[PDB]
């Protein structure tokens, strides 16, 4: 099918952690950017308008651009950048399946490293693995890092000389993340993305993960893990069988990443919360103001298209 989307690039501020507000260049004014969910073989058209003060592009990571290399989104290689206030149209066929993503390719150390210019691109295979057909919940986890010294000033950041002192999944640091709520018998697909500049050792308590896909393509030899290392650019898809009711934390195991501004706890932490488990008065997330779409799991059920999410939206000046 032909699927055409209109996207903008916006200057907004997001709250990453308690007391860390961050200036970002959010696709449609949000970080992570909108989910794009299409089927293998679709013809995708994305019309991009740059409503920011700086040039950008969009590169479609994992899209082969078969005969469409001029839509690869690389400044000085496949296009000139999209200048401030201008527009540009990308066209490609989604012939590469799986968990893909998209991100700016201008000034990437800063724009991708700390300005939130990235989002997920999910291409459904026409022939999914049998296990993918058992899945009852699909979960996107995009990990990145943040340098508080440059929170308030575009044009700086993302170098070896900066200090990454805050860490997130889907642009929030615990306790501002949200739980992953399941019930016994769920079959959970988790898609990990190395969206920023860090390495993240994602560990699920209470469960092993079956690693089924690397960079969106299915492994001939899937393997179990309780800790999956995710580095910049990579994606891993795993399956968790939710057959062990409890409250089981699920987090980056890199010790300095479970901090926020030098304080603990913080960072890319969630909890696999099973519906049937009674809640204790001392539970950190008792009475959480819950967002069921923090991992895009509701949008992923709503058919093909492009989906914004207000839990990811920042504030305009």
Known binding residues for Cu(2+) are 56, 59, 61, 103-105, 111, 117, 203, 205, 251, 253
**33 forms part of the interface with a second copy (CB under 8 A):** no
User: What's the Cα-to-Cα distance from 283 to each of 37, 86, 150, 172, 180, rounded to whole Å?
Assistant: 35, 49, 34, 20, 15
User: Are 299 and 292 contacting, i.e. CB atoms less than 8 angstroms apart?
Assistant: no
**249 forms part of the interface with a second copy (CB under 8 A):** yes
**86 forms part of the interface with Cl ion (CB under 5 A):** no
Following DSSP, what letter does each residue of 193-218 receive, concatenated?
EE-SSS-EEEEETT--EEEEEETTEE
- What mask of x and - would describe binding to a second copy in positions 35 to 74, judged by CB under 8 A? ------------------------x-xx-xxxx-xx-x-x
The nearer residue to a second copy, 261 or 311, going by C-beta atoms, is 261
Residues from 100 through 139 that contact Cu ion (CB under 5 A): 104, 106, 111, 117
- What mask of x and - would describe binding to Cl ion in positions 177 to 216, judged by CB under 5 A? ------xx--------------------------------
Binding a second copy (rule: CB under 8 A), the pick from 203, 288, 298, 313 is: 203
Residues from 246 through 305 that contact Cl ion (CB under 5 A): 274-276
Instruction: For residue 310, give the 3-state DSSP assignment.
Output: helix
**220 forms part of the interface with a second copy (CB under 8 A):** yes
**243 forms part of the interface with Cl ion (CB under 5 A):** no
| Span from 131-139, 165-173, 175-183, 193-201 in contact with Cl ion (CB under 5 A) | 175-183
B/e letters for 1-35, b = 16+ CB within 10 Å, e = fewer, are eebebebebbbbbbebbeebebbbbbbbbbbbbbb
The nearer residue to a second copy, 26 or 194, going by C-beta atoms, is 194
**183 forms part of the interface with a second copy (CB under 8 A):** no
- Distance, CA of 250 to CA of 227 (rounded, Å): 10
Helix (H) or strand (E) holding 98: strand 98-103
**61 forms part of the interface with Cu ion (CB under 5 A):** yes
- Distance, CA of 188 to CA of 177 (rounded, Å): 18
Contacts of 4 (CB under 8 A, 6+ apart): 44, 45, 46, 47
197 binding partner (options Cl ion, a second copy, Cu ion, none; Cβ < 5 to 8 Å by kind)? a second copy
Residues from 269 through 308 that contact a second copy (CB under 8 A): 271, 277, 282-284
Specify binding-site residues.
Answer: 56, 59, 61, 103-105, 111, 117, 203, 205, 251, 253
Phi, psi dihedral angles at 301 (to 5 degrees) = -95, -5
Question: For tokens 């926020």, what's the residue?
Answer: 260
- Side-chain-side CA neighbours of 210 within 13 Å: the count stands at 17
Q: How many CB atoms lie within 10 A of CB 243?
A: 13
**255 forms part of the interface with a second copy (CB under 8 A):** yes
Interacting residues with Cu ion (CB under 5 A): 56, 61, 104, 106, 111, 117, 205, 233
Interacting residues with Cl ion (CB under 5 A): 183-184, 245, 274-276
């Amino acid at each position: 099918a032909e699927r055409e989307f209109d996207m903008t690039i916006e200057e907004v501020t997001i709250k990453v952690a308690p007391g860390l507000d961050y200036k970002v260049f959010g696709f449609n004014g949000q970080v992570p950017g909108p989910l794009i969910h299409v089927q293998e073989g679709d013809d995708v058209i994305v019309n991009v308008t740059n409503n920011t003060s700086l040039p950008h592009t969009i590169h479609w990571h994992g899209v082969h651009q078969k005969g469409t290399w001029r839509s690869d989104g690389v400044p000085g290689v496949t296009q000139q950048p999209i200048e401030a206030g201008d527009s540009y149209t990308y066209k490609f066929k989604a012939d590469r399946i799986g968990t893909l993503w998209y991100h700016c390719h201008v000034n990437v150390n800063e724009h991708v490293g700390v300005r939130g210019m990235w989002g997920p691109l999910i291409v459904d295979p026409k022939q999914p693995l049998p296990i993918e057909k058992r899945v009852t919940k699909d979960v996107i986890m995009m990990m990145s890092t943040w340098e508080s010294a440059v929170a308030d000033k575009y044009g700086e950041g993302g170098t070896p000389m900066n200090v990454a002192d805050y860490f997130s999944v889907n642009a929030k640091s615990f306790p501002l993340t949200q739980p992953l709520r399941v019930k016994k018998g769920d079959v959970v697909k988790i898609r990990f993305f190395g969206a920023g500049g860090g390495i993240h050792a994602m560990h699920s308590h209470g469960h092993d993960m079956l690693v089924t896909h690397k960079d969106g393509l299915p492994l001939d030899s899937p393997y179990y893990a309780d800790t999956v290392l995710v580095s910049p650019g990579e994606r891993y898809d795993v399956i968790i069988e939710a057959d062990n009711p409890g409250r089981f934390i699920f987090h980056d195991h890199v010790d300095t990443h479970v901090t926020a501004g030098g304080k603990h706890p913080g960072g890319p932490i969630t909890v696999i919360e099973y519906d049937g488990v009674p809640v204790d008065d001392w539970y950190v997330w008792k009475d959480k103001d819950y967002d069921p779409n923090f991992f895009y799991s509701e949008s992923l059920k709503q058919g093909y298209g492009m989906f914004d999410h207000d839990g990811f939206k920042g504030e305009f000046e």
